[PDB]
Paper text:
In this study, we structurally characterize the interaction of the broadest and most potent [name]-targeting antibody, [name], with viral membrane lipids and scaffolded [name] and propose how [name] approaches the [name]-viral membrane epitope during neutralization. The membrane proximal external region ([name]) of Env is one of its most conserved regions and, hence, the focus of vaccine and therapeutic design efforts. To aid in characterization of the complete [name] epitope consisting of [name] and lipids, we designed an epitope-scaffold that presented the [name] on a stable framework in the [name]-bound conformation derived from previous crystal structures. [name] is a variant of the previously reported T117 epitope-scaffold that presents the [name] core helical epitope residues and binds to mature [name] with 29 pM affinity.
Overall, mutants 1 to 3 were constructed to coat the presumed membrane-interacting surface of [name] with different amounts of negative charge to investigate binding affinity and specificity of the [name] epitope (protein and lipid) and to examine the effects of the mutations on neutralization potency. X-ray structures of mutants 1–3 and 5 were determined in complex with the [name] scaffold at 1.6 Å (mutant 1) and 2.0–2.2 Å (mutants 2, 3 and 5) resolution. Superposition of the Cα atoms of the variable domains of mutants and wild-type [name] shows nearly identical conformations (Cα r.m.s.d. of 0.40, 0.23, 0.31 and 0.39 Å for mutants 1, 2, 3, and 5, respectively). The four mutant structures show different bound ligands depending on the residue mutated and on the components of the crystallization mother liquor and cryoprotectants (n.b. all mutants were crystallized without lipids and in different conditions). In mutant 2 for which Arg29(L) was mutated to glutamate, only water molecules seem to occupy this site when ethylene glycol was used for cryoprotection rather than glycerol. A more significant decrease in neutralization was observed for mutant 2. In contrast, mutants 2, 3 and 5 each eluted as a single peak with a molecular weight of approximately 150 kDa. None of the mutations affect binding to [name] (in agreement with the SPR study) as the mutant CDRH3 conformations are almost identical to wild-type [name].
Author numbering:
A (entry chain O): 11 to 164
B (entry chain H): 1 to 52, 52A, 52B, 52C, 53 to 82, 82A, 82B, 82C, ...
C (entry chain L): 3 to 9, 11 to 95, 95A, 95B, 95C, 96 to 213
The structure:
């Protein structure tokens, strides 16, 4: 299944770069041995080459990830950004994407990858739930996301 | 360079077993999904089954008509893929391919579990399931006649009947006659045995002077036949 | 579960579309393979818009409803081949499946009528309790013929074996047909006939038990 724990959610401040977000969101996954040590660096490498900016409304979303061979156990870490930060567009668009919600994926199983992308697609199209992600605290977000993830593994 | 090399194909009786091997090099085999595909004689490609990677715990899916009789496995330390086949049936006969399998999923329009595609293939190994026994051909002359002469040239040959298994080689005049020689691919009869024909087109103006001897060699039965084909009277 | 048309013909230099139909294509993309006899398949296209690099740009794939299509813009003589689609057998399935394959004929050569040669049973074979009519079909183009046998004038379906056509060394095609019958049947009728139809033209050879072999 997919490991999603309380310190896999965190709010991030106003002055963080794309690389800071990656490293922060990956820190607890490394610490828990969910991923290899240089996992953040491969996510940055993969992002520089295959961007994951989703310009959905009302809140921009990003799905940074790397290769499944760098994963030891399935996990997801979630980031809420104080200010919007720009990601390059996933559909090859030249315009950057403002993003306030980040789903870092550390999935080694193809069936989880597709189940999780499908779920994220339904989630960012829920205008209500997106607006909650911008006001809930970490314990609320962790409680809400956790029960939803559990609905995928079954 | 990617290389996939299948082995282990052969002849097997209905109800028996066979183990196919596929040696892989030039890519990250340990993390690759790998698929077996077969092509029955004169038929299309048929998906047989697929073994996944480490993240999926090397799980396997199988086509329905093969489920419970076939097992796919791998030995990553030596970069080998295997297909084990039990209770074989005549319809399992055909050419079995090894294929390195990619995964695809489009975020906005895809549906789980996306799609698998076959990005590198081996050349195949042939599986023949048949209760027939080794048997050498009977060889009958195909005499030239006025009916087998267009005008400038004449047609004569050898009928190579009821042998098994493939193949048989046919030469003329011990490999001295190559021009105008046409050995047709074998037909497989409902009996389980093969038949083919070799005909040579020769100068209409030479049938009385030139000898024509077809040399039939069937290695699987250790049989050689030499057969003079002449006009009949 | 994936249906393709048995065969299509295209003129050299034209554009042709090959399609594949199935319920699962409403949810999944198709991949496309070229195969020629005695050679490994080659992936041509997969997904929404993925052409593996090294595949010529004239190949392109598309999707609409329960159909997927491969388009070849400017068919070349190399493209004469069999084309297979592949996808999930059912939406959400972990299994895969191929379509039955489409044979694409690219007309890169003048049409050539088949040479037909029909041999009667040999007396040697008559002395064994068997008898074989041998109809050899050579040098035709394109590479599809149908063969019909006749006892006198009436047709016979029993004991016919026809090979699939095979490419000769000079790019034309060959096939052979065999009519097996008993020596009583052979001496019974006044003649037998092999009828080879090719591009609406039927050429017929005939042999008679009034001997010659």
């Amino acid at each position: 299944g997919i490991h999603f724990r309380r310190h896999y959610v965190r709010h991030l401040p106003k002055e963080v770069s794309q690389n800071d977000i990656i490293k922060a969101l990956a820190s607890p996954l490394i610490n828990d041995g969910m991923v290899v040590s240089d996992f953040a660096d491969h996510v940055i490498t993969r992002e520089q080459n295959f961007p994951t900016g989703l310009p959905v409304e009302p809140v921009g979303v990003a799905i940074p990830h790397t290769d499944s061979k760098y994963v030891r156990q399935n996990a997801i870490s979630v980031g809420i950004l104080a200010e919007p930060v720009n990601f390059e567009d996933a559909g090859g668009e030249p315009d950057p994407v403002p993003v306030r919600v980040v789903f870092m994926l550390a999935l080694g199983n193809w069936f989880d990858i597709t189940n999780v992308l499908w779920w994220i697609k339904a989630v960012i199209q829920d205008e209500d739930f997106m607006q909650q992600l911008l006001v809930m605290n970490d314990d609320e977000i962790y409680q809400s996301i956790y029960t939803r993830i559990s609905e995928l593994e079954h | 360079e990617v290389q996939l090399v299948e082995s282990g194909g052969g002849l097997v009786k209905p109800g028996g077993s066979l183990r196919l091997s596929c040696s892989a090099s030039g890519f990250d085999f340990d993390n690759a999904w790998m698929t077996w595909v077969r092509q029955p004689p004169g038929k299309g490609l048929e998906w047989v089954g697929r073994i996944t990677g480490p993240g999926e715990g090397w799980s396997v899916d199988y086509a329905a008509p093969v489920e419970g009789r076939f097992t796919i496995s791998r030995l990553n330390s030596i970069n080998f893929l295997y297909l084990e086949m039990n209770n074989l049936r005549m319809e399992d006969s055909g050419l079995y391919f090894c294929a390195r399998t990619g995964k695809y999923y489009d975020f906005w329009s895809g549906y789980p579990p996306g799609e698998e595609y076959f990005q590198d293939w081996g050349r195949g190994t042939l599986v023949t399931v048949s209760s027939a026994s080794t048997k050498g051909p009977s060889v009958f002359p195909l005499a030239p006649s006025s009916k087998s002469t267009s005008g400038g040239t004449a047609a004569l040959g050898c009928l190579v009947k009821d042998y098994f298994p493939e193949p048989v080689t046919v030469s003329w005049n011990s490999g001295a006659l190559t021009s105008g020689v046409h050995t047709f691919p074998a037909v497989l009869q409902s009996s389980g045995l093969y038949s083919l024909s070799s005909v040579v087109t020769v100068p209409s103006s030479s049938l009385g002077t030139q000898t024509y001897i077809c040399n039939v060699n069937h290695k699987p039965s250790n049989t050689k036949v030499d057969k003079r084909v002449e006009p009949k009277s | 579960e994936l249906t393709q048309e048995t065969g299509v013909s295209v003129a050299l230099g034209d554009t042709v579309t090959i399609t594949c139909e199935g319920d699962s294509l409403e949810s999944h993309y198709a991949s496309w393979y070229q195969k020629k006899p005695g050679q490994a398949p080659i992936l041509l296209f997969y997904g929404k818009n993925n052409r593996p690099s090294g595949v010529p740009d004239r190949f392109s794939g598309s999707a609409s409803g329960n159909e997927a299509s491969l388009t070849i813009s400017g068919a070349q003589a190399e493209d004469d081949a069999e084309y297979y689609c592949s996808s999930r057998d059912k939406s959400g399935s972990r299994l895969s499946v191929f379509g039955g394959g489409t044979k694409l004929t690219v007309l890169s050569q003048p049409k050539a009528a088949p040479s037909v040669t029909l041999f009667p049973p040999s007396s040697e074979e008559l002395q064994a309790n068997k008898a074989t009519l041998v109809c050899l079909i050579s040098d035709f183009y394109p590479g599809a013929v149908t063969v019909a046998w006749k006892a006198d004038s009436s047709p016979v379906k029993a004991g016919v074996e026809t090979t699939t056509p095979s490419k000769q060394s000079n790019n034309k095609y060959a096939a052979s047909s065999y009519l097996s019958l008993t020596p009583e049947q052979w001496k019974s009728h006044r003649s037998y006939s092999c009828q080879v139809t090719h591009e609406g033209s039927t050429v017929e050879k005939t042999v008679a038990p009034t001997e010659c072999s």
